Amino acid sequence: MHRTYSLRNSRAPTASQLQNPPPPPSTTKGRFFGKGGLAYSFRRSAAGAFGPELSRKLSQLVKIEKNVLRSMELTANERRDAAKQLSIWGLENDDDVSDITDKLGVLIYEVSELDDQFIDRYDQYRLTLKSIRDIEGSVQPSRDRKDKITDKIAYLKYKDPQSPKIEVLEQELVRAEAESLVAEAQLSNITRSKLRAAFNYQFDSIIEHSEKIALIAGYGKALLELLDDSPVTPGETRPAYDGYEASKQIIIDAESALNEWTLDSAQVKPT
Amino acid sequence: MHRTYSLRNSRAPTASQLQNPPPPPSTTKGRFFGKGGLAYSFRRSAAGAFGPELSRKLSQLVKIEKNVLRSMELTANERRDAAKQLSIWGLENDDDVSDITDKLGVLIYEVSELDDQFIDRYDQYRLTLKSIRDIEGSVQPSRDRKDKITDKIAYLKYKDPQSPKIEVLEQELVRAEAESLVAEAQLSNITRSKLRAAFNYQFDSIIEHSEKIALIAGYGKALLELLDDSPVTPGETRPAYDGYEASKQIIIDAESALNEWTLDSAQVKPT
Amino acid sequence: MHRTYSLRNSRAPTASQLQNPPPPPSTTKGRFFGKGGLAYSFRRSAAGAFGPELSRKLSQLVKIEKNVLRSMELTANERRDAAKQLSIWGLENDDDVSDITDKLGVLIYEVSELDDQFIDRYDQYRLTLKSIRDIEGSVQPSRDRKDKITDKIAYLKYKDPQSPKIEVLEQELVRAEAESLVAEAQLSNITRSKLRAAFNYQFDSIIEHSEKIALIAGYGKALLELLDDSPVTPGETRPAYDGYEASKQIIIDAESALNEWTLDSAQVKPT
Amino acid sequence: MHRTYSLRNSRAPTASQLQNPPPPPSTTKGRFFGKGGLAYSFRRSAAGAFGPELSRKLSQLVKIEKNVLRSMELTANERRDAAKQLSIWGLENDDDVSDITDKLGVLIYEVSELDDQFIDRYDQYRLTLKSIRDIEGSVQPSRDRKDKITDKIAYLKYKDPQSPKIEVLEQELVRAEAESLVAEAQLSNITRSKLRAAFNYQFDSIIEHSEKIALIAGYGKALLELLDDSPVTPGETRPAYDGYEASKQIIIDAESALNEWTLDSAQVKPT
């Protein structure tokens, strides 16, 4: 949607893009459907199946959100595995390198834990959407019966103008219309309420998790200053790294700001 | 790591947790290994295989990062699919609901695009780690040959104290020691440089993407105020929604702040 | 490109769309490639063939423009055939209907003649683009030879640092570089000149033809007022149509404004 | 719990660890369950069996404490056997070596006797916990009957709103609620009292036994100064050891301080 007014689907570069040019496209693009294969697309296909034809789209969205959740669960546990592997690799290295890589590993572990909490809040969002899907599916048969009744009464009117069955189904249809009006009014109310609440909670969760992980990334950037990037000539060895206390103080302050973080202290501000 | 001083692996609740209690654990936990099956664990197993035994851990980390990248690619394209499906579902709904859900869909599309950019920067990180892995693997055979030579010269010294072969291999080993000292000095220098640069770039990328997505979430929260959550009684219909201009102004301001965003204008601040 | 900021390729409705809703999509969409079949796509395929690899895109554009011209020629002659058929159909009808349909037929004939003139100016545009394509194709072998020479001199430098052939090809390459600089400077100049002139002439031609056909359509709309749309009851016949003089005066004034039309009298004005 | 803020379960080294590096892990780790086999795990399994489902955890803890007591009894008698064996081995050795090893053996015998006294106090602790377990098990059926009665009255309310049985069980349930409130109040009081008293007595016993054994270890360290560690050249024999009186005085003073030890004279002081 950010594409410029040209013939190319090229997004307009932001100030960050001008500051640092965008990198080349990733080489990880594999020759695959990109939906987890037929095994993971079985759920997607089953979403588009014999349903109430009304919550079909909503049920499909819910099951797609379940796929989202499964993928995020896959990238959280295996990311914390990556952090563990990074610490294991940094075990046998320079003392400053080992300390700094262990601190980066623990920061990534914090990242994975926040991802898991975001996953739980995502499941709350998905459960609210499941509730709205189920109430919509329960309210659909009312309108289905309404459509069937109006079609049958139209056919009966075609057959003759004085069948008692005609008047009886008209009398039942005036009841069905009122019940369907009430059902659709409450359906609109519940859909609006669930939609607003679920998406407000979802956006609050994502902004909280994202600003928290950004607060973590800033602390990690500050921590990365401890190691010295000055190259050392072959032969003599550089002085030993004694910044253990500084790194521990940095991680302590990061923990303190992490625990102190609250919705009131949301330094992110729109304009 | 955030667990309290008890016998349970229960993290200390932050101020957000006190404000709103944590949700129950997700029900999406499936009975599976959680590593993409044996097909996706084949790469992990092949990482732990006949290698230079030094970059084995680093190569394993690189391939794990590739799995991270593949999972993120899976959750980006399929998340934008979820946004498209959400817009399709909101097609047939209330005018305010349709407009607001289309705007949420476009915000999620922005989220997916930022995820793709983060994936490209992640691939830059992974390529830098590939470079460091390859230089470490190229420098390992020096120390391997050193170990073999010292073992053989020890055995030859055991056999006799005056073999010419002994003195010749000692003379070659004093050269190998100097070349290995130079190789290890440059190895330490290149590892420190690549590590610092790659992880500083990675943390800058993640903080940029995260604060940007948080800036997006805040704008979405402000946008969600447009719809009215007041329930409507059955019968009469609420007044029509004319806040199209307000929503378009909100999205225009979001685009303006998106393009204006720069590293200098990083309102996230550590302490 | 006019699509709104949503997930749909739906263009933003203009004031005309609000005034009158857009019609449903045309039912003439056939199950075909839409490029005139393989017979008409043979030229397109031959455009992408063994060429100078530089004017390949420009030659493809020229041949596509030739297809444009052929299609326009098809719709001009056969449109004037449609006008003739309309007059033939209106031969046996009411006197007012016959006169008005003959006048509409002659207006459509004027439309077809203006289309033919637009086709001739289009051929002028295509010939200018053919000229620019041919000069670009003639200038490409200079850079092709430059690339070949630099590759060969790089290989020769690899072989040895003192071959006389090396210095001779360097001396010829410094000449080739100067001639290629001159060739590219004149190529840029001629491309800019031809591009600006051809497209300015093309846009002047299209605005002239379009505003002329619009001036024709307005006169036709004024002429359509002559016939009476008031329904007539069965039985008695409505009074005879005597507006022959009015229709002839309208067509005379249309001819006068047609001949008087000039680029100076271009009442279309941008802002 | 003492692990640092890293990815490893490595405890933070104390000042003693810096003074002397920690030894390598023990080689006595056998390939076994570590719970005394299935014979000693039969009691543990029987703890988790058909019980009042409330004191199940407490009964399991009590039986685990019994296993603790049995293991300590095993290591006390067999440790005093080790001391006897040490004296037997030192029977045929140097006079100073024989005397010093006999004194170490008697110190270890004192250690075993203090261990036996600690075992008796441990049994006092276990008996207090048995008492609290038994009162909790006796109070559980009250709440079990309460739950059964409320379930049955809910079902009866489902069946009809006017069964006399309903009102009779409500009248009995208001009595059961009051008796359960009294039972839970006295249960909380007795649990708090028994818990505080038993664990205060247990901690006093362990600090007394530990500081006593430390007072013993210090005296043994002072006693070890009697023997001479200076190596003797082959040939002539070092002067005979006449420090029998010094060793007897040391053991006499150790006995005097042992008998004089009291809770008031607890030189161990927290801060």
mmCIF file of C-alpha atoms in Angstrom, chain A:
data_model
loop_
_atom_site.group_PDB
_atom_site.id
_atom_site.type_symbol
_atom_site.label_atom_id
_atom_site.label_comp_id
_atom_site.label_asym_id
_atom_site.label_seq_id
_atom_site.Cartn_x
_atom_site.Cartn_y
_atom_site.Cartn_z
ATOM 1 C CA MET A 1 0.000 0.000 0.000
ATOM 2 C CA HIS A 2 3.047 2.215 0.522
ATOM 3 C CA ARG A 3 3.948 1.986 -3.177
ATOM 4 C CA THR A 4 4.531 5.257 -5.007
ATOM 5 C CA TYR A 5 2.510 6.577 -7.956
ATOM 6 C CA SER A 6 4.343 4.530 -10.570
ATOM 7 C CA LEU A 7 3.943 1.232 -12.417
ATOM 8 C CA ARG A 8 6.074 -0.675 -9.879
ATOM 9 C CA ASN A 9 5.058 -2.157 -6.532
ATOM 10 C CA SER A 10 7.940 -0.296 -4.895
ATOM 11 C CA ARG A 11 7.187 1.329 -1.551
ATOM 12 C CA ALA A 12 8.190 4.936 -1.002
ATOM 13 C CA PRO A 13 11.491 4.971 0.939
ATOM 14 C CA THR A 14 11.239 6.447 4.425
ATOM 15 C CA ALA A 15 13.918 8.568 6.092
ATOM 16 C CA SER A 16 15.499 5.385 7.459
ATOM 17 C CA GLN A 17 15.808 4.032 3.914
ATOM 18 C CA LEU A 18 17.583 7.215 2.819
ATOM 19 C CA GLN A 19 19.854 7.011 5.874
ATOM 20 C CA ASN A 20 20.789 3.383 5.165
ATOM 21 C CA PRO A 21 19.929 1.739 1.836
ATOM 22 C CA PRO A 22 17.624 -1.279 1.981
ATOM 23 C CA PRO A 23 19.369 -4.662 1.900
ATOM 24 C CA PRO A 24 18.959 -7.090 -1.012
ATOM 25 C CA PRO A 25 16.016 -9.509 -0.823
ATOM 26 C CA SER A 26 16.500 -12.558 1.366
ATOM 27 C CA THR A 27 17.967 -15.706 -0.181
ATOM 28 C CA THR A 28 15.829 -17.946 2.057
ATOM 29 C CA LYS A 29 12.938 -17.904 -0.448
ATOM 30 C CA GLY A 30 12.298 -21.593 -1.055
ATOM 31 C CA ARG A 31 10.397 -23.303 -3.859
ATOM 32 C CA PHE A 32 7.314 -24.084 -1.791
ATOM 33 C CA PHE A 33 3.716 -22.986 -1.318
ATOM 34 C CA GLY A 34 4.631 -21.064 1.837
ATOM 35 C CA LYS A 35 1.641 -22.373 3.824
ATOM 36 C CA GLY A 36 3.336 -25.254 5.647
ATOM 37 C CA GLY A 37 2.525 -27.783 2.932
ATOM 38 C CA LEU A 38 -0.652 -29.754 2.407
ATOM 39 C CA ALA A 39 -0.538 -30.951 6.024
ATOM 40 C CA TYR A 40 -0.840 -27.384 7.326
ATOM 41 C CA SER A 41 -3.188 -26.402 4.478
ATOM 42 C CA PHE A 42 -5.618 -29.188 5.412
ATOM 43 C CA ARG A 43 -7.006 -26.953 8.161
ATOM 44 C CA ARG A 44 -7.322 -24.045 5.720
ATOM 45 C CA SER A 45 -9.193 -26.248 3.241
ATOM 46 C CA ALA A 46 -11.454 -27.619 5.992
ATOM 47 C CA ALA A 47 -12.304 -24.038 6.957
ATOM 48 C CA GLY A 48 -13.800 -23.624 3.484
ATOM 49 C CA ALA A 49 -16.189 -26.559 3.792
ATOM 50 C CA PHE A 50 -19.762 -27.445 4.745
ATOM 51 C CA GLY A 51 -20.442 -24.660 7.225
ATOM 52 C CA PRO A 52 -23.201 -22.135 7.908
ATOM 53 C CA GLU A 53 -21.865 -20.178 4.892
ATOM 54 C CA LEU A 54 -21.886 -17.044 7.076
ATOM 55 C CA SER A 55 -19.153 -17.685 9.647
ATOM 56 C CA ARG A 56 -17.197 -19.534 6.948
ATOM 57 C CA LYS A 57 -14.988 -16.488 6.415
ATOM 58 C CA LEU A 58 -14.727 -15.868 10.159
ATOM 59 C CA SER A 59 -13.920 -19.519 10.886
ATOM 60 C CA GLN A 60 -11.306 -19.430 8.127
ATOM 61 C CA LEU A 61 -9.803 -16.321 9.713
ATOM 62 C CA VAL A 62 -9.774 -18.021 13.123
ATOM 63 C CA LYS A 63 -8.008 -21.098 11.764
ATOM 64 C CA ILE A 64 -5.535 -18.890 9.892
ATOM 65 C CA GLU A 65 -4.887 -17.131 13.200
ATOM 66 C CA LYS A 66 -4.267 -20.567 14.702
ATOM 67 C CA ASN A 67 -1.661 -21.142 11.999
ATOM 68 C CA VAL A 68 -0.183 -17.756 12.934
ATOM 69 C CA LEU A 69 -0.040 -18.884 16.553
ATOM 70 C CA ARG A 70 1.587 -22.207 15.681
ATOM 71 C CA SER A 71 4.243 -20.496 13.558
ATOM 72 C CA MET A 72 4.947 -17.974 16.322
ATOM 73 C CA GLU A 73 5.232 -20.825 18.822
ATOM 74 C CA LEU A 74 7.682 -22.494 16.447
ATOM 75 C CA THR A 75 9.825 -19.356 16.205
ATOM 76 C CA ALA A 76 9.749 -18.641 19.948
ATOM 77 C CA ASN A 77 10.945 -21.973 21.349
ATOM 78 C CA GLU A 78 13.453 -22.418 18.541
ATOM 79 C CA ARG A 79 14.662 -18.814 18.981
ATOM 80 C CA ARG A 80 15.350 -19.508 22.651
ATOM 81 C CA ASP A 81 17.161 -22.616 21.417
ATOM 82 C CA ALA A 82 19.194 -20.283 19.194
ATOM 83 C CA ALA A 83 20.040 -18.159 22.241
ATOM 84 C CA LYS A 84 21.159 -21.259 24.146
ATOM 85 C CA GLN A 85 23.305 -22.285 21.179
ATOM 86 C CA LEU A 86 24.821 -18.794 21.042
ATOM 87 C CA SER A 87 25.799 -19.026 24.707
ATOM 88 C CA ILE A 88 27.259 -22.496 24.108
ATOM 89 C CA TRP A 89 29.309 -21.141 21.202
ATOM 90 C CA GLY A 90 30.511 -18.191 23.260
ATOM 91 C CA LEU A 91 31.595 -20.524 26.055
ATOM 92 C CA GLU A 92 35.041 -20.951 24.459
ATOM 93 C CA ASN A 93 36.078 -17.436 23.452
ATOM 94 C CA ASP A 94 37.539 -14.246 24.892
ATOM 95 C CA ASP A 95 36.382 -13.292 28.381
ATOM 96 C CA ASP A 96 34.784 -10.046 27.206
ATOM 97 C CA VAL A 97 33.338 -11.850 24.182
ATOM 98 C CA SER A 98 32.004 -14.661 26.375
ATOM 99 C CA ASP A 99 30.401 -12.258 28.854
ATOM 100 C CA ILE A 100 28.863 -10.053 26.168
ATOM 101 C CA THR A 101 27.519 -13.019 24.198
ATOM 102 C CA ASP A 102 26.039 -14.535 27.358
ATOM 103 C CA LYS A 103 24.305 -11.221 28.043
ATOM 104 C CA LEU A 104 23.000 -11.115 24.467
ATOM 105 C CA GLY A 105 21.774 -14.679 24.936
ATOM 106 C CA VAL A 106 19.890 -13.764 28.094
ATOM 107 C CA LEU A 107 18.399 -10.746 26.300
ATOM 108 C CA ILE A 108 17.218 -13.057 23.514
ATOM 109 C CA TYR A 109 15.773 -15.345 26.194
ATOM 110 C CA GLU A 110 13.835 -12.355 27.525
ATOM 111 C CA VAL A 111 12.710 -11.741 23.938
ATOM 112 C CA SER A 112 11.430 -15.314 23.678
ATOM 113 C CA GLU A 113 9.591 -15.054 27.002
ATOM 114 C CA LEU A 114 7.899 -11.842 25.866
ATOM 115 C CA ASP A 115 7.036 -13.629 22.625
ATOM 116 C CA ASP A 116 5.378 -16.405 24.637
ATOM 117 C CA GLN A 117 3.355 -13.855 26.611
ATOM 118 C CA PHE A 118 2.366 -12.208 23.325
ATOM 119 C CA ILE A 119 1.319 -15.673 22.129
ATOM 120 C CA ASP A 120 -0.937 -16.095 25.157
ATOM 121 C CA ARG A 121 -2.537 -12.699 24.528
ATOM 122 C CA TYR A 122 -2.857 -13.697 20.868
ATOM 123 C CA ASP A 123 -4.746 -16.779 22.028
ATOM 124 C CA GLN A 124 -7.034 -14.496 24.030
ATOM 125 C CA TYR A 125 -7.665 -12.552 20.816
ATOM 126 C CA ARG A 126 -8.290 -15.793 18.914
ATOM 127 C CA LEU A 127 -10.691 -17.024 21.603
ATOM 128 C CA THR A 128 -12.696 -13.800 21.432
ATOM 129 C CA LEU A 129 -12.850 -14.224 17.661
ATOM 130 C CA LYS A 130 -13.923 -17.842 18.185
ATOM 131 C CA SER A 131 -16.759 -16.598 20.389
ATOM 132 C CA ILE A 132 -17.893 -14.078 17.778
ATOM 133 C CA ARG A 133 -17.640 -16.752 15.068
ATOM 134 C CA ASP A 134 -19.763 -19.153 17.097
ATOM 135 C CA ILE A 135 -22.500 -16.626 17.877
ATOM 136 C CA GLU A 136 -22.609 -15.634 14.202
ATOM 137 C CA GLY A 137 -22.858 -19.298 13.212
ATOM 138 C CA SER A 138 -25.667 -19.802 15.713
ATOM 139 C CA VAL A 139 -27.543 -16.769 14.374
ATOM 140 C CA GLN A 140 -27.206 -17.767 10.702
ATOM 141 C CA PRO A 141 -29.871 -20.552 10.725
ATOM 142 C CA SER A 142 -32.489 -17.936 11.619
ATOM 143 C CA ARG A 143 -31.933 -16.108 8.331
ATOM 144 C CA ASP A 144 -31.542 -19.433 6.507
ATOM 145 C CA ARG A 145 -34.996 -20.491 7.713
ATOM 146 C CA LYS A 146 -36.323 -17.032 6.833
ATOM 147 C CA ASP A 147 -35.071 -17.381 3.249
ATOM 148 C CA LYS A 148 -36.482 -20.904 2.949
ATOM 149 C CA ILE A 149 -39.867 -19.809 4.309
ATOM 150 C CA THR A 150 -40.126 -16.803 2.003
ATOM 151 C CA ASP A 151 -39.225 -18.951 -1.014
ATOM 152 C CA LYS A 152 -41.817 -21.569 -0.068
ATOM 153 C CA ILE A 153 -44.523 -18.963 0.552
ATOM 154 C CA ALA A 154 -43.738 -17.354 -2.811
ATOM 155 C CA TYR A 155 -44.149 -20.732 -4.512
ATOM 156 C CA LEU A 156 -47.390 -21.378 -2.620
ATOM 157 C CA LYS A 157 -48.676 -17.943 -3.653
ATOM 158 C CA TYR A 158 -47.828 -18.923 -7.229
ATOM 159 C CA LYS A 159 -49.875 -22.109 -6.859
ATOM 160 C CA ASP A 160 -53.034 -20.450 -5.502
ATOM 161 C CA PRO A 161 -54.122 -17.315 -3.588
ATOM 162 C CA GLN A 162 -56.200 -18.983 -0.850
ATOM 163 C CA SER A 163 -54.368 -22.002 0.583
ATOM 164 C CA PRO A 164 -54.637 -22.068 4.400
ATOM 165 C CA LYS A 165 -51.008 -23.180 4.426
ATOM 166 C CA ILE A 166 -50.161 -19.829 2.814
ATOM 167 C CA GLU A 167 -51.714 -17.785 5.608
ATOM 168 C CA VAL A 168 -50.243 -20.051 8.283
ATOM 169 C CA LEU A 169 -46.715 -19.650 6.914
ATOM 170 C CA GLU A 170 -47.270 -15.905 6.556
ATOM 171 C CA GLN A 171 -48.266 -15.792 10.228
ATOM 172 C CA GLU A 172 -45.175 -17.791 11.146
ATOM 173 C CA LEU A 173 -43.009 -15.601 8.888
ATOM 174 C CA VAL A 174 -44.118 -12.397 10.589
ATOM 175 C CA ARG A 175 -42.867 -14.002 13.818
ATOM 176 C CA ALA A 176 -39.656 -15.152 12.134
ATOM 177 C CA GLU A 177 -39.052 -11.634 10.814
ATOM 178 C CA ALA A 178 -39.342 -10.099 14.284
ATOM 179 C CA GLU A 179 -37.105 -12.758 15.818
ATOM 180 C CA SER A 180 -34.586 -12.262 13.002
ATOM 181 C CA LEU A 181 -34.651 -8.494 13.530
ATOM 182 C CA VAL A 182 -33.917 -9.002 17.228
ATOM 183 C CA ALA A 183 -31.263 -11.601 16.390
ATOM 184 C CA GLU A 184 -29.552 -9.299 13.891
ATOM 185 C CA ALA A 185 -29.670 -6.336 16.280
ATOM 186 C CA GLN A 186 -28.039 -8.359 19.051
ATOM 187 C CA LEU A 187 -25.659 -9.869 16.479
ATOM 188 C CA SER A 188 -24.517 -6.413 15.386
ATOM 189 C CA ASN A 189 -24.154 -5.321 19.011
ATOM 190 C CA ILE A 190 -22.140 -8.387 20.032
ATOM 191 C CA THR A 191 -19.983 -8.226 16.899
ATOM 192 C CA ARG A 192 -19.157 -4.566 17.492
ATOM 193 C CA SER A 193 -18.425 -5.146 21.184
ATOM 194 C CA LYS A 194 -16.276 -8.243 20.658
ATOM 195 C CA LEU A 195 -14.484 -6.679 17.684
ATOM 196 C CA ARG A 196 -13.630 -3.452 19.508
ATOM 197 C CA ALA A 197 -12.619 -5.154 22.758
ATOM 198 C CA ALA A 198 -10.575 -7.922 21.136
ATOM 199 C CA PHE A 199 -8.712 -5.634 18.757
ATOM 200 C CA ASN A 200 -8.108 -2.939 21.376
ATOM 201 C CA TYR A 201 -6.677 -5.615 23.676
ATOM 202 C CA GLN A 202 -4.659 -7.052 20.779
ATOM 203 C CA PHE A 203 -3.209 -3.662 19.869
ATOM 204 C CA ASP A 204 -2.441 -2.875 23.507
ATOM 205 C CA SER A 205 -0.694 -6.243 23.806
ATOM 206 C CA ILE A 206 1.333 -5.737 20.640
ATOM 207 C CA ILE A 207 2.358 -2.181 21.545
ATOM 208 C CA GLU A 208 3.325 -3.310 25.052
ATOM 209 C CA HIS A 209 5.374 -6.265 23.801
ATOM 210 C CA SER A 210 6.956 -4.225 21.010
ATOM 211 C CA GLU A 211 7.908 -1.215 23.122
ATOM 212 C CA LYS A 212 9.230 -3.606 25.771
ATOM 213 C CA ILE A 213 11.383 -5.453 23.234
ATOM 214 C CA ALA A 214 12.564 -2.080 21.917
ATOM 215 C CA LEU A 215 13.470 -1.024 25.466
ATOM 216 C CA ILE A 216 15.412 -4.295 25.611
ATOM 217 C CA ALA A 217 17.137 -3.621 22.284
ATOM 218 C CA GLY A 218 18.217 -0.163 23.427
ATOM 219 C CA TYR A 219 19.724 -1.619 26.591
ATOM 220 C CA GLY A 220 21.495 -4.235 24.489
ATOM 221 C CA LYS A 221 22.883 -1.522 22.222
ATOM 222 C CA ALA A 222 24.171 0.326 25.287
ATOM 223 C CA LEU A 223 25.655 -2.931 26.602
ATOM 224 C CA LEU A 224 27.462 -3.629 23.322
ATOM 225 C CA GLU A 225 29.664 -0.592 24.021
ATOM 226 C CA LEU A 226 31.553 -2.588 26.674
ATOM 227 C CA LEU A 227 33.648 -4.658 24.270
ATOM 228 C CA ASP A 228 36.525 -2.969 22.452
ATOM 229 C CA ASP A 229 36.510 -3.095 18.653
ATOM 230 C CA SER A 230 40.076 -1.796 18.334
ATOM 231 C CA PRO A 231 42.157 -4.435 16.513
ATOM 232 C CA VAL A 232 45.136 -5.940 18.321
ATOM 233 C CA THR A 233 48.467 -6.574 16.636
ATOM 234 C CA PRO A 234 49.747 -10.171 16.561
ATOM 235 C CA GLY A 235 51.975 -11.006 19.492
ATOM 236 C CA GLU A 236 51.149 -9.187 22.717
ATOM 237 C CA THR A 237 47.706 -9.562 24.286
ATOM 238 C CA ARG A 238 45.329 -6.717 25.092
ATOM 239 C CA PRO A 239 44.632 -5.922 28.764
ATOM 240 C CA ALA A 240 42.118 -8.175 30.476
ATOM 241 C CA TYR A 241 38.439 -7.227 30.505
ATOM 242 C CA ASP A 242 37.289 -6.093 33.958
ATOM 243 C CA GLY A 243 33.902 -4.666 32.965
ATOM 244 C CA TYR A 244 31.955 -7.461 34.636
ATOM 245 C CA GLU A 245 30.515 -5.022 37.177
ATOM 246 C CA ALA A 246 29.425 -2.618 34.432
ATOM 247 C CA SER A 247 27.646 -5.383 32.511
ATOM 248 C CA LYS A 248 25.941 -6.654 35.662
ATOM 249 C CA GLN A 249 24.847 -3.105 36.506
ATOM 250 C CA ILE A 250 23.462 -2.705 32.980
ATOM 251 C CA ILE A 251 21.480 -5.935 33.248
ATOM 252 C CA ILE A 252 20.272 -4.954 36.737
ATOM 253 C CA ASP A 253 19.040 -1.591 35.455
ATOM 254 C CA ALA A 254 17.386 -3.350 32.512
ATOM 255 C CA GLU A 255 15.586 -5.677 34.930
ATOM 256 C CA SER A 256 14.532 -2.707 37.066
ATOM 257 C CA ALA A 257 13.105 -0.834 34.077
ATOM 258 C CA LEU A 258 11.463 -4.065 32.907
ATOM 259 C CA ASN A 259 9.657 -4.572 36.213
ATOM 260 C CA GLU A 260 8.851 -0.855 36.501
ATOM 261 C CA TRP A 261 7.306 -0.756 33.017
ATOM 262 C CA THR A 262 3.585 -0.007 33.027
ATOM 263 C CA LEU A 263 0.922 1.217 30.625
ATOM 264 C CA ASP A 264 1.107 4.648 32.266
ATOM 265 C CA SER A 265 4.865 4.755 31.594
ATOM 266 C CA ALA A 266 4.336 4.269 27.847
ATOM 267 C CA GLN A 267 6.947 6.641 26.440
ATOM 268 C CA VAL A 268 5.795 5.809 22.898
ATOM 269 C CA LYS A 269 3.556 8.653 21.756
ATOM 270 C CA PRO A 270 1.593 9.090 18.509
ATOM 271 C CA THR A 271 0.971 12.455 16.886
#
